[PDB]
């Protein structure tokens, strides 16, 4: 049990960042370990799945 941004052993007070790595309370933030993940794209994808494309009643059937 240890971090990767400072090798400081922790144990049960470690962290599990999206990038698969464990961090201490000082380095848990994505801006303290240069997280290489497109949070914006998982953005444009979650909002697109939760957002219902409304349809003004028009050109329905035959």
């Amino acid at each position: 049990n240890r971090c990767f941004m400072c090798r400081k052993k922790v144990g049960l007070t470690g962290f599990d960042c999206r990038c698969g790595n464990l961090f201490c309370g000082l380095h848990r933030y994505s801006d303290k370990h240069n997280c290489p993940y497109d949070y914006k794209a998982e953005a444009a994808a979650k909002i697109r799945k939760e957002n219902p494309v409304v349809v003004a009643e028009k050109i329905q059937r035959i």
Binding site: T13, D16, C17
Partner: peptide, 22 residues
């Protein structure tokens, strides 16, 4: 809702994972 999303509650998080996760 992985723990990287939540912030400003390290101690309490430890006290929870202790009481439940372990």
């Amino acid at each position: 809702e992985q723990y990287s999303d939540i912030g400003g509650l390290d101690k309490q998080i430890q006290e929870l994972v202790e009481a439940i996760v372990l």
